[PDB]
Amino acid sequence: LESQYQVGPLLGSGGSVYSGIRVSDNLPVAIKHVEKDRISDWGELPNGTRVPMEVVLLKKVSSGFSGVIRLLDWFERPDSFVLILERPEPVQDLFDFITERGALQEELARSFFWQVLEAVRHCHNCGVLHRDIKDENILIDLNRGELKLIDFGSGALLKDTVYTDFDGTRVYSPPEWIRYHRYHGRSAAVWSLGILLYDMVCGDIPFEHDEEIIRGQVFFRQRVSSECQHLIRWCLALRPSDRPTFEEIQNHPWMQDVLLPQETAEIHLH
Numbered sequence: 001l002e003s004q005y006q007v008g009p010l011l012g013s014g015g016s017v018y019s020g021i022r023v024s025d026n027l028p029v030a031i032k033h034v035e036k037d038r039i040s041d042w043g044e045l046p047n048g049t050r051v052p053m054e055v056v057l058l059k060k061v062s063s064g065f066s067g068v069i070r071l072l073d074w075f076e077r078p079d080s081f082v083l084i085l086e087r088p089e090p091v092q093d094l095f096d097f098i099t100e101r102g103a104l105q106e107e108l109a110r111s112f113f114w115q116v117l118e119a120v121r122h123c124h125n126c127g128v129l130h131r132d133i134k135d136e137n138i139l140i141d142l143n144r145g146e147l148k149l150i151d152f153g154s155g156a157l158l159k160d161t162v163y164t165d166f167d168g169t170r171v172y173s174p175p176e177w178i179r180y181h182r183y184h185g186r187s188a189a190v191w192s193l194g195i196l197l198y199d200m201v202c203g204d205i206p207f208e209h210d211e212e213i214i215r216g217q218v219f220f221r222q223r224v225s226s227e228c229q230h231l232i233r234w235c236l237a238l239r240p241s242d243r244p245t246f247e248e249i250q251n252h253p254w255m256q257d258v259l260l261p262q263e264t265a266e267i268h269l270h
């Protein structure tokens with residue numbers, strides 16, 4: 001009936017997301033609506049029910065692991081789908097967080113960035129490729145210091161062969177996409193993570209136009225340490241095969257002695 005939930009106010013659109021409470025528990029949730037007409041990419045659930053790929057991917061990552069948003073439930077309507085998603089409270093998305101705090105201290109960027117890496121690796125381990133990693137698609141559970149990856153609407157099943165379709169954010173896409181319309185999932189993901197790390201520590205993204213992406217020359221507009229500059233420049237190698245693996249990123253020197261999430265909440269967030 002979908003009145004297991006009380007809909008509250010619109011939180012935004014880009015489908016459309018509203019705030020809600022589960023009626024049992026009063027558990028907080030996000031209610032996301034997606035029009036069938038606007039959905040390009042579809043899958044089949046284990047029972048072979050036709051659903052948006054978004055839902056397939058959410059169930060595949062679904063888990064006790066808190067670094068990826070939990071899909072609590074979903075409904076099909078004549079012309080739409082509705083997803084019941086987890087809502088942290090208090091919460092704030094990383095784009096707003098950075099917009100208001102500016103460039104982040106490296107300690108805090110390290111914790112954040114690490115948590116994002118752990119979430120992305122969990123996605124890849126569950127056979128899922130996000131394809132739209134960026135500040136707007138990351139939520140901060142302000143009390144626990146835990147980040148949550150959201151919005152699998154542009155995702156795909158992870159594969160080892162080449163992708164020739166892309167539907168995520170252009171300014172996070174890698175040079176191979178812009179000029180050949182071809183990428184591999186992991187290396188493109190590593191590129192976007194480089195953009196994101198640069199955004200964390202410089203307070204904005206490094207490239208606006210396609211010409212810039214393709215030239216891939218990185219200028220630091222803020223004071224960033226050499227270790228962090230190195231890691232970023234590596235993730236943003238032009239040649240996909242010169243990018244680090246996730247293991248090399250997490251073994252990188254800038255990335256050592258990460259804070260635990262709760263420490264992170266205590267020092268930077270409360």
Ligand SMILES: O=C(O)c1ccc2c(c1)nc(Nc1cccc(Cl)c1)c1ccncc12
Nearest residue numbers: 011012013014017030085086087088150151
């Ligand atoms: O898409 C998901 O997987 C997805 C999943 C969870 C949330 C979400 C998107 N979007 C939120 N906010 C939001 C705010 C403005 C515009 C839009 Cl489109 C969404 C939000 C807020 C609080 N708790 C969970 C969520």
Ligand SMILES: [Cl-]
Nearest residue numbers: 105106107108
């Ligand atoms: Cl530091």
